[PDB]
């Protein structure tokens, strides 16, 4: 019933020689991409990535594109400013990434507000949980922190975190509800692999589930074999659902003593399977 | 909707 979040993942990557830096903005509602902006395009526009976003009128798309257009200028300047802070040359390609947004609880009250920057893949600065102070990761970030402290940026930011973010989150949740809050139970099965030895391979498959979060465990009559278990990272099937598998190496003939447990939020009760 | 980012 719980907590939800609205987060924007921002990226600016310079490409000296070729033109201007590539800029992107991606919004996620509970981990699902719903809006997207990419400057490496024809006539770059804020674009809906979920069909339910289409209910937002032209106003929304113009205002959010204008907003991204200005953010894009801030990031171009950030890119040139950092090169000077670290004394790097102008030929190289560098990146800046940001994660901004909030986590809200069931009561609709703000739980957590995020604002973290990374330069070239390493942490640079981040707003603290108090929502008033920043933590710098290097000497270069103290300059930024100092500037932000002087201008009262955390305050500007906190105002967006607790107001605009929260309010919009609620609205996004109201309009994408059915799709956002949908659940597709995973279809499970077990397969047998051998390679002419005295050992077999039991692989537990979890397919076509949504959301992505899932847990698969192999048991030997009560024992969760986490040490002797081999499994892959959850991966996108490409159609909105996900896949995952967990395998264990079992003694030929001792198949029927091993059990796979499928924990997913669409399941009324956890799944339990064996070779068949 | 996203925020209006200042610079570093």
């Amino acid at each position, epitope marked *: 019933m719980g907590p939800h979040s609205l987060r924007y993942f921002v990226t600016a990557v310079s490409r000296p020689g070729l033109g201007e830096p590539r800029y992107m903005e991606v919004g996620y509602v509970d981990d699902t991409e719903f809006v997207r902006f990419d400057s490496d395009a024809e006539n770059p526009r804020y674009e809906p990535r979920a069909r339910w976003m289409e209910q937002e009128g032209p106003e929304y798309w113009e205002r959010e594109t204008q907003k991204a257009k200005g953010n894009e200028q801030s990031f171009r300047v950030d890119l040139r400013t950092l090169l000077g802070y670290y004394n790097q040359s102008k030929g190289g390609s560098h990146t800046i990434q940001v994660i901004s947004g909030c986590e809200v609880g069931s009561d609709g009250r703000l739980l957590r507000g995020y604002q973290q920057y990374a330069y070239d893949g390493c942490d640079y600065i981040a707003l603290n949980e108090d929502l008033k102070t920043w933590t710098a990761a290097d000497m270069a970030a103290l300059i930024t922190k100092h500037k932000w402290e002087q*201008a009262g940026e955390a305050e500007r930011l906190r*105002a967006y975190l607790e107001g605009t973010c929260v309010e919009w989150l609620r609205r996004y949740l109201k309009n994408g509800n059915a799709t956002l809050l949908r659940t597709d139970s995973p279809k499970a099965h077990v397969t047998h692999h051998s390679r002419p030895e005295d050992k077999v391979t039991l692989r537990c498959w979890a397919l076509g589930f949504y959301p992505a979060d899932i847990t698969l465990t192999w048991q030997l009559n009560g024992e969760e074999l986490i040490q002797d278990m081999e499994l892959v990272e959850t991966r996108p099937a490409g159609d909105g659902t996900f896949q995952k598998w967990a395998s264990v190496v079992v003694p030929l003939g001792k198949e029927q003593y091993y059990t796979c447990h499928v924990y997913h939020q669409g399941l009324p009760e956890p799944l339990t399977l064996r070779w068949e | 909707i996203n925020f209006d980012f200042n610079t570093i």
Partner: T-cell receptor, first 115, second 112 residues
């Protein structure tokens, strides 16, 4: 977007004056400012109000009366000196189209202080 | 006296003559620089904001043609032409792009 109805004001030193400012914005976060222009043309920054700051900004003998619900941001100069005679400007940021640092200015209200 | 250095202070602009204004930032804490005009009725109007050296823009208003260029990190230029009426040009500086105070230079009084 920014309107200051009064054209001019005339008072005697030591008096308290209130310059009116009414604005129109659809932004959730917004920034209001008061500037002053002397005979010379110098445009001087006086005081500002953040739409998200719950309190009325106060600086020296300049005080603001921010009435969010009425969209009013009057400038109150308490107990006036001859030095305060000038054109008072009210402004609000109102960027669009890639403007970056666009302030919208009211037409200004002239203030006079007789010795 | 401000954080900016504008020259000329004033200038007589002949009929078909273009004129050039220069603005120098004296405090590097405020790199966002703009050009504002103030008419004879005394209405301030924003014209340009150019943060990065190389930035150049052309804008034509009723009464004046303008071409602005951020030359260096501390230098903002303006070329004004086809101005049928007097007006003063002010340079402003700010510490960042959104929500930071703008501070005014002393201006360049263009007289006709």
């Amino acid at each position: 977007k920014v309107t200051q109805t009064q054209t001019s004001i005339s008072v005697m030193e030591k008096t308290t004056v209130t310059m009116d400012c009414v604005y129109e914005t659809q932004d959730s976060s917004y920034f209001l400012f008061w500037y002053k222009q002397t005979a010379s043309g110098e445009i001087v920054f006086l005081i500002r109000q953040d739409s998200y700051k719950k309190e009325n900004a106060t600086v020296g003998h300049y005080s603001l009366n921010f009435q969010k619900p009425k969209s009013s941001i009057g400038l109150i100069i308490t107990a006036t000196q001859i030095e305060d005679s000038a054109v008072y400007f009210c402004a609000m940021r109102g960027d669009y189209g890639g403007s970056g640092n666009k302030l919208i200015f009211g037409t200004g209200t002239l203030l006079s202080v007789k010795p | 006296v401000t954080l900016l250095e504008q020259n000329p202070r004033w200038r007589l602009v002949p009929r078909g003559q273009a004129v050039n204004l220069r603005c120098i930032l004296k405090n590097s804490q405020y790199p966002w620089m703009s050009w504002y005009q103030q008419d004879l009725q005394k209405q301030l109007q924003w014209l340009f904001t150019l943060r990065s050296p190389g930035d150049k823009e052309v804008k034509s208003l009723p009464g004046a043609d303008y071409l602005a260029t951020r030359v260096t990190d501390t230098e903002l230029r303006l070329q004004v032409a086809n101005m049928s009426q007097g007006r003063t040009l002010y340079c402003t500086c700010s510490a960042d792009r959104v929500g930071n105070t703008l501070y005014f230079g002393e201006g360049s009084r263009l007289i006709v």
